[model samples]
Target: TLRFAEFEDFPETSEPVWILGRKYSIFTEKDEILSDVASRLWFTYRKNFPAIGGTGPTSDTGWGCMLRCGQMIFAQALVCRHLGRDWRWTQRKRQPDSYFSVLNAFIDRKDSYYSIHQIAQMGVGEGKSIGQWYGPNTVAQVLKKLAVFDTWSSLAVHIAMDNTVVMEEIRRLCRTSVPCAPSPWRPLVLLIPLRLGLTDINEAYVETLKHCFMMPQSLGVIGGKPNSAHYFIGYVGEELIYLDPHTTQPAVEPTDGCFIPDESFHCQHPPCRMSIAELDPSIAVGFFCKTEDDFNDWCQQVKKLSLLGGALPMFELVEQQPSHLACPDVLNLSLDSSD
Candidate 1:
């Protein structure tokens, strides 16, 4: 069991003088939960962010998918561990594909969403513990599982109103069984919100707390320039055909874009843009990456930022930014999908 400085650990901050064994820095409480379990990944990967791909308005840049995903996984893992059931959610527990939080996954067996759990199973079963939770044939299957168990779905749950100190302590406890980075003493916290209807969850309600991330996914950018300037925004460019855009070696640019159907990767300069899907919200601004190379590159940039003492801020949930609960976000938000 690793340890960290909690409100109970610092007495000076809790001071007047001797308010017991509490720490001075943790007087009333500040949020240090973002890097608690997250720091472990930093130690192992030598990086800051797990992954992100997008950037945009203050909204998009301030989202917190990592922490949210982490908490989801943490909470669900406990349920799985306690129930002795298989891992059926996302997470990053000294392992790949871990999430921080969970969505409400309860439903009738005959419901159309019943297949969603199977999809989540696909992601959770990616590596290790194959004996228990894996059945992945391709990355497609894994992504299916992720889509089914997303955070938006979980925020639809009835609240856990048990006011026990143990439950609160559970939220404060360190769920990761590993050493974190830099300062070795900061734990994480988890808080589950209630199941809310579209009307109940609003941006005004969310922005009031203001602590999630840069922008929660599915964001809106009010204004933008017309040229390559928007390039920095979350739009993905066309696939750079791997076929050499040029065959001349000693020419201007030393690279070529090529695309081939042959399932063989035996050539050095075979092609550059062969299968490049810059699927947007490029970690430069968001959290979903489709390729390992893309994920790593984003990690590099984040680590560089952290080294410069630029504290990485996260997104606090800002209500439901006009969802498709009634009508599609494209039309009347209250229109029934039955149309």
Candidate 2:
């Protein structure tokens, strides 16, 4: 059972980046870049290359879409420094369907042991089965684990307990006091949870994307009706250009402790124009920023957006410090204890 979706594109972002030996926008779609990267790297997974006793290796996870989205953003950001002529203008271009292996290869180059399977397993937590649910906040922690530690052990500390200490610990790991340049290889990911503070889309929110995308942030999104996998790669004025990942076909279902063909898993995933109004009170937002300034600029704009309709919006931190913080932990504790 293979599920399919509807999608089309016509769009165009800026940076110190070079593509095909020319200045490139950070918004360059990952499909083109990853395809070129893989062809140059000389590898591709043409079929199911099973790993960890799971379904054949491919982008289509029975449910690990968010984990794969993180990988895509990380890979896209890392490739910016590697100069290349526009493959679209060259005879050598990437295969139409090679982003999965391309991104996998990119991550493998960084840590040969990285896999969405392992990440998803840790995300769903131990003592659990595959295809389990990972809510917005928990998924945020998983993204932090992948960026900060890139290992499962960092996430395995809490399966023994049925609580959120692991998430709290991981949050501390992702928070930074000083802004630093984003490493394409290990950029800082910020999961911004948006709430309905405005009855409509605000310019402040649009400006937020403008600022973040201009900083060349590697962005992905996790919302829509029955959200699976989506991306915000670049913007055409105020309209966001997105990558829809629900296109992979041949659905796989888990049965008797194994994956089997299941047609019921099929559904259409489409990429369409969504306005700031559509994004208002967005369920959740995620992106990778290179510096504290980049993230801060984004947050500042969001703050203004929240004030648009006189409604207070909460900006929860999934990773990276919010613009403000209190005094030293020890000093604060001493004051509280003294009082």
Candidate 3:
């Protein structure tokens, strides 16, 4: 592991603290440095997350899909940006993907803390681990792991509850705090609230989102049950083209030349087809893009869809404005003359 210096090695003002045994400066004169730190942290995140899924027993099963999907989506977001792109998630690891922190309780375990074992223990594969049901807290945990904390609290903003609301909050923040000079963390997470009941996504809207990218295969399900949350990649006549996440790698199959089809197999790994039978709607969607202008353009298209009378629950969600707790202000400290 590449090691940074201890807390005492850092400059003045902030008293001194240790995060994972490494020195982290709270207040840097040049905020750009802080941004660089976040970028480095993202690099570390990619190493541990990617193509890492669970097996049946206490693994990345029903309960782990959200984290797997989040990992896949975030990895795709890194490449979709107009700047700073690289291939990192393609690497292999010694451990299973389930070996990481999914719950706060795992962090309390002293033996597991500060390592992948902590993260692995977080997912005991308890409730609904078979059907894959996860709440908004899953999304919150994903973002928190990515390290996009509030400017005030220095805490990763959890409770990114409703997709539309979170997206709109991001939109408003983009408009207010970001416009010409983008936040160092440009290409913020663009949470797209897809409209349900619409036969197909708007062609113009698809065109606008062409610049942005995501891992549709991992996100086959939105807020609903399995495959319901999959975003509309495109439409083929009456058939909707969807990238299914439930089963990216096909299940283990019989080797005989003559094989009988299985319903369960199909449910998990539905062949990419033009049939309109097993169609699902894209309810909660998000992406990482080049600029705030990208978000503005996206909002315009969504607004147009809303104006045309398409039932967009996401628009309402975007306006909801989920609350985040801000950390109290820190006191200033003067340097000692006797050094």
Indicate which candidate wins on lDDT: 2
Q: State which candidate has the highest TM-score.
A: 2
Residue-wise C-alpha lDDT for candidate 1, range 1-339, written one tens digit per residue: 001212122222332210001111324332221122112111000112112212211111112122122222333323332221222221332221121211122110112121222333343455522113221122222433433344333211111111111222222232323444422212221222221113222222222111112221111111111111111111112221111111111111111222111111111221122112221111111132122233234335333433322232222222123423532111112212342
Alpha-carbon local distance difference test for all models: 0.21, 0.37, 0.32
Task: Give stretches of model 1 more than 4 Å off.
Answer: 1-8, 11-25, 30-103, 106-120, 123-144, 148-339
- Model 3 worst lDDT window (10 residues): 39-48
1-339 per-residue lDDT for model 2 (tens digits)? 114333444333442322222223437554554333222221111113234344434443445554444444444433322221132212344323233333343232223323555555556553334555444445445544554453321111111011111224333444544334532122245454443234344444455444444433334444432344444554444465444444343322223322222222211222344554555333345444344455455545544544544323333222333326532211001112223
lDDT (Cα) of model 2:
0.37
lDDT of 3: 0.32
lDDT for predicted candidate 1 compared with the true structure = 0.21
Per-candidate TM-scores read 0.19, 0.48, 0.41
Sort the predicted structures by TM-score, highest score first: 2, 3, 1
lDDT of 3 by residue, 114-183 (tens): 2222233343333323334543234424444443432321221223333333465565444434334324
